[PDB]
Amino acid sequence: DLLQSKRFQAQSLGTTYIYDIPEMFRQSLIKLWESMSTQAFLPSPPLPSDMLTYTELVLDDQGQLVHMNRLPGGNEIGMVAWKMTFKSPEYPEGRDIIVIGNDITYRIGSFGPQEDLLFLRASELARAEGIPRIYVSANSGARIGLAEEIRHMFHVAWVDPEDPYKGYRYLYLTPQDYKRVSALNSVHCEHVEDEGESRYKITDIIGKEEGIGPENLRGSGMIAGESSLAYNEIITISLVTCRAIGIGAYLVRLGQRTIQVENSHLILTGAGALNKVLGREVYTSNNQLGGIQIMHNNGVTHCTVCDDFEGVFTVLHWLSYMPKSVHSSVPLLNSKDPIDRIIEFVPTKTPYDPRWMLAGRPHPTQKGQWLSGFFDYGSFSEIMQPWAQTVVVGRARLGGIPVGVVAVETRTVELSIPADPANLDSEAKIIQQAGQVWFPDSAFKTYQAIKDFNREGLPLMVFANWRGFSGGMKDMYDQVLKFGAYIVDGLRECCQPVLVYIPPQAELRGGSWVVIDSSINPRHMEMYADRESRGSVLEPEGTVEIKFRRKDLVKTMRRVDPVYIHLAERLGTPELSTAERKELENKLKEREEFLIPIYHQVAVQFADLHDTPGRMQEKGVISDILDWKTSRTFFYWRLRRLLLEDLVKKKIHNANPELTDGQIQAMLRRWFVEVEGTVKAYVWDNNKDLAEWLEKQLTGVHSVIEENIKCISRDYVLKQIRSLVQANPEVAMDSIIHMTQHISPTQRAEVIRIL
Amino acid sequence: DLLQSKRFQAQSLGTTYIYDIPEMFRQSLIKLWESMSTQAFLPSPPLPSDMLTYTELVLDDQGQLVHMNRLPGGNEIGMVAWKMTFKSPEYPEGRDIIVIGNDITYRIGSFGPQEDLLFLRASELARAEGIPRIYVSANSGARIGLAEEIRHMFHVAWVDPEDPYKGYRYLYLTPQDYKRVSALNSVHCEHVEDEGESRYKITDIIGKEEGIGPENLRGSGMIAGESSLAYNEIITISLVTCRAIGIGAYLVRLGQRTIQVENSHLILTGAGALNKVLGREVYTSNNQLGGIQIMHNNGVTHCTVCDDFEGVFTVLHWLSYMPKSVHSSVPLLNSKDPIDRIIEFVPTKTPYDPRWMLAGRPHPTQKGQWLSGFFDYGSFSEIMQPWAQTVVVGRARLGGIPVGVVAVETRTVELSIPADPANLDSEAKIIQQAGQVWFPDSAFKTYQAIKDFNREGLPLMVFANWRGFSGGMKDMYDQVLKFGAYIVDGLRECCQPVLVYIPPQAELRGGSWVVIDSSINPRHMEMYADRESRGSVLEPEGTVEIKFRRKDLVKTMRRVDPVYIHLAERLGTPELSTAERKELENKLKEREEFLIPIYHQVAVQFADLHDTPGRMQEKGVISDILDWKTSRTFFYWRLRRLLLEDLVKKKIHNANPELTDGQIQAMLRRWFVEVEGTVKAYVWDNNKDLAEWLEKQLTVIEENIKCISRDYVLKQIRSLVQANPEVAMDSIIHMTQHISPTQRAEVIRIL
Secondary structure, eight states, X not given: OXXXXXXXXXXXXXXXXXXXXXXXXHHXXXXXXXXXXXXXXXXXXXXXXXXXXXXXXXXXXXXXXXXXXXXXXXXXXXXXXXEEEEOOSSOTTOEXXXXXXXXXXXXXXXXXXXXXXXXXXXXXXXXXXXXXXXXXXXXXXXXXXXXXXXXXXXXXXXXXXXXXXXXXXXXXXXXXXXXXXXXXXXXXXXXXXXXXXXXXXXXXXXXXXXXXXXXXXXXXXXXXXXXXXXXXXXXXXXXXXXXXXXXXXXXXXXXXXXEEETTOEEESSOHHHHHHHHTSOOOSOHHHHHSHHHHHHHTSOSEEXXXXXXXXXXXXHHHTTSOSSTTSOOOXXXXXXXXXXXXXXXXXXXXXXXXXXXXXXXXXXXXTOEEOOSSOTTOOEEESTTSSTTEEEEEEEETTEEEEEEEEOOSOEEEEOOOOTTSSSOOOOEEEEOTTEEOHHHHHHHHHHHHHHHHHTOOEEEEOOBOEEOOSHHHHHTTHHHHHHHHHHHHHTOOSOEEEEEOTTOEEEHHXXXXXXXXXXXXXXXXXXXXXXXXXXXXXXXXXXXXXXXHHHHHHHHHHOHHHHHHHHHHTOSSOOHHHHHHHHHHHHHHHHHHHHHHHHHHHHHHHTTSSHHHHHHTTSSSEEEOGGGHHHHHHHHHHHHHHHHHHHHHHHHHOTTSXXXXXXXXXXXXXXXXXXXXXXXXXXXXXXXXXXXXXXXXXXXXXXXXXXXXXXXXXXXXXXXXXXXHXXXXXXXXXXXXXXXXXXXXXXXXXXXX | OHHHHHHHHHHHTTXXXXXXHHHHHHHHHHHHHHHHHHHEEOOOOOOHHXXXXXXEEEEOTTSOEEEEOXXXXXXXXXXEEEEEEEOOSSOTTOEEEEEEEXXXXXXXXXXXXXXXXXXXXXXXHHHHHTOOEEEEEOOOOBOOOOOHHHHTTOEEEESOTTOGGGOEEEEEEOHHHHHHHGGGTOEEXXXXXXXXXXXXXXXXXXXXXXXXXXXXXXXXXHHHHHHHHHXXXXXXXXXXXSEEETHHHHHHHHTOEEEEETTOEEESSOXXXXXXXXXXXXXXXXXXXXXXXXXXXXXXXSEEESSHHHHHHHHHHHHTTSOSSTTSOOOOOEESSOSSOOOOOOOOSSOOOHHHHHHOEEOSSSTTOEEOOSSOTTOOEEESTTSSTTXXXXXXXXXTEXXXXXXXXXXXXXXXOOOOTTOSSOOOOEEEEOTTEEOHHHHHHHHHHHHHHHHHXXXXXXXXXXXXXXXXXXXXXXXXXXXXXXXXXXXXXXXXXXXXXXXXXXXEEHHHHHTTOGGGSTTTEEEEEETTOEEESSOHHHHHHHHSOHXXXXXXXXXXXXXXXXXXXXXXXXXXXXXXXXXXXXXXHHHHXXXXXXXXXXXXXXXXXXXXXXXXXHTTSSSEEEOGGGHHHHHHHHHHHHXXXXXXXXHXXXXXXXXXHHHHHHHHHHHHHHHHOGGGGGGGGOHHHHHHHHHHHHOOOHHHHHHHHHXXXXXXXXXXXXXXGGGHHHHHHXXXXXXXXXXXXXXXXXX
């Protein structure tokens, strides 16, 4: 087939032929079923033929999408798209996605207006159904061209033919040549008599070939816009295979979640172009500009893979944490890591890799045993690892509930900054980034993680351990203030549970606390402190510095140090010689000075006792003091009901949008007490037990809530009709005639009663 | 006396006493009336006493906001707030704002929970009424403290009393001392028997004094959140007077639009704190960290002023471009700069300050005349000038219509990067930033302008002249790709007209075009190109490089160059000596090489002819080709009707929310033709004439809308009952009230 020819052509470009992608999904999906059986209890996999179904989406005459079951290799434009349904470990009954891909073999994978349109319409469909959009990008950006019909027939109006370097005046077509293109919308000319001959001065070249013109600019913008909207409406993921150029780059980025194969590059302008502009061979490879060594290191790319197969797997792997559609809840697994276990790994005052805290680590002594982490064994999947490494973000599972995750590096990061080849001064610098601090990069990565996960529909778990934002000259100049603010915007827009936990030996202070306080989004945020955690506006050393200065240290001495006491007691005698006095005062001053260091230490301790969880809870800024060993169990159940409670409350809100978050809470709580009895109030505060109860309501008499909501809606619909008539009374009479047109003859009787 | 005392205390801190702020508004407002009479025809100003009214907002017992009539100097917390109404040149019948301010004299302007709550509630009120929120920031961030009641009575459990430096075990209270604080929520202890005596080991200190604890952390977060929301709901402006620290800093930023007095600073941690952490005196002054030389240069601060008075003026100056409330349209002036004039200043291939294009410039020869710019004389007010200077942003007025403005620098910028004192290697670098390029900074500044203006409710005018984003190693690493994308997000959210115009000698290419195409937000965006503009996916030189390579240049020579043609003709001669041949072939290759440069120029020209406005319009990517001299007149009217049309369409959408943007357009257009006659269809395409017509209607259509609503309300009541029939009976009971006893008789004839 031309098929053999095209696959070779793709391989020779270091990518996969577009129509091989679907089967690459099937193979990857098999690998997923295998890898996940480690982590969870799964049913027996389906047979591979029943595992996946695809249908090609193709543009009709009217530019409308049409589902077509045709043989591969049939594309007449440089873009291909499919709807795919497949059975996965997390969604064994099946889940749908839309996949769009460039065909790098068709016109070097350029983006013409038709290519742009298919992309648009596939995206539009993804949004229509609420399902994720996967884009495989391997392209050359917007299509380029010159009007062939004119190129081969134009003439130059030389200042002087016997010397061209004396300049030219204009380009033109002979009347013979004009008389043919003229009918066809190819050029605009103005006739002129010049040097004796009659000529057609070319003023504009329009070009009879559609798709090589500024229409491509609109088309590109068009799908740029679409992608911006998509990110905000559905799950978007993108895989960069060979190269994504220009609009290709922008689409990949607007999609946000990005996988990049090694040796692929993601660029706006090519090393060649730039070298010509700079007058020498500055850059040797596009990877210098757009390779993973730029984009993985700056957070544009989330993950890198060695090949296309591993790319597709990653897509499916990510989706395994994500709800099937936007109308859907997060997909739960039955994990092999039990829920009622203790966490063996313990965070320490000594610095440590926080990945150990999340995923666990190998045992230092009797290997190959395993010090268990907080999350389900094998569930933590990081992203953006090498960028802003002061913070660590990823997805994991807690009892098989997928969550998004943020944690803090405690060890000093050593950031390597590559040399700018453009600039001959630049050598590769090496920067210290302290642990437990937000820098501009870290703050940005944190914000990004918050946004992305939130749009996937995941709950959030923040393991807060930040001493502050770096507030030094450089970092302030580098806009650390701007990005700290963003974290606030980010959390405020969260729509599912956000649980913040200060782990043992962690601390949370001042600026860092303020931008993640539960107050920002009380509807959804919750804050917890381990017994062995600490938190304040200001750390003890800095507090003492301001509010336990010398005068106060000495006061403390006067109360506690016996020597000072004795001396002070004597200065408190009347009728002393000014001699004896000055001697005493000096003895006291010497004592004071000798005692200051130790008493300073006492002072920081004193301050530290103010910063405890005990106080935090008492003052109402945290929901509970937890204990790390059992934090996993706690959080499973808590998250589990937060999710269920939310699900029911969402139903209530639909019944009557006018009801406050607050009144809704109360209403549900009141309905529980009504059903289960005033005697059982306390149960409400038990996560496990309320979780079981809520679930039974949602899945004869477990139509108790369901009945109340029907009530709430009836009432609202009444209030709504009332409001309309209040505003529009001439409408009353006719509304009734229409309303009565059918109802029970015994209700017609009643109507007459009431009026 | 206390007031005298407090004002001196403020002045000694280089700021203004809080209760003097209101009168600083009155004085500033007078200055505004004076400065704007230059620009615009105004009524006579009102008398100063009638110009402005303020009323102090105060927290009641229930934590609720209350208007209160009391004498200045009365605050019992470190925050003060007022509702203000004043008559201004742009809003002479009056406009309202909410003003909140720290009292730096009360507990060094710290933020306790009560202070936090007043701020919250004043902000809430602003949002409630849709009016702007002005925050005057002069503060020390979150309040700090230690439990006094415990500090003066705790004891230390020494490892050894005969030597304290042998360490201590714990702190504690004597039972005598415990027996009193215990009742009062001050501490947590556990009893212990130790060294014979009975002690109360202190485990947690809670502190009976409210406001010095972690409640302050919640309170701060609380108003951070509020400010984030407020920015997205109403106009927010902030003035930094002495210093804003921590939460103060964040609130200033969340508010976004930020005026900073010189020598003030805006910081997270003080130079002292940091120096302690770093073990050396690295920083000498908070201005190093947060002074205008940092924040004006990185776009956190929009403007700087020399003193507080000029600050308040700036606030009022900015507001003069902004609608009274969110329920309100942009405030129009009758400007003294006429609408039907030509623009005298003309953009050039030679680089130039684009401010000249906007504001005009002084005449090079016969001064003091003035080469007029595009916008109303004296109307252009820039922001973020020294940051990312490759782009220029600000607000201006076009025929007295305020708009937000983005333009592009054409001259090379020289960026100075200061040395990091933390790092002893760092020497101050100096960077070239090419004109007509988006860099990360320029892109971010452009995004930020877009967002800020859009939330003010201003239309947008972009004078596009970008060759592309910088795509070089450094800038790619520096995330230029991320910020380019943001521009798209920014324009997509715009809710009022966005008019893009490629000025004469400007160009718009590839990446830069795609992120601002009208396609992103077709409901509101429009794109225009001057005859003398150019645009492509790729510039000519780069297009030729790819698609008019040597083979094709030589092909052109073989067709056109007579010498080459002649030689080629001969290389076709029979029976030649291999000598004569090799000579001819060489003469050809030499000719070719000689001709290449000139023919490459020909090729770029050919490419360039593809990049014209003619083509752009023809292919449907721009709405019209304009001519610069008359572009002001054009855009005034166009903007003017886009605004009026939008206003009417908004009314239609209200009458029936189910109608599409599309069907609404059609409906209005159809109504016009109905009213004015099928003969007059063409008028619709005349901005001025349709503008006049629309205005007449808004001051026959009004009837049609009433119709559309009645219909909708009917269908809506229907639809509700269809879905919810148990509701029928009760809906009738309520409905019967609104009907004639003779209609009840009718209903009965069928019920």
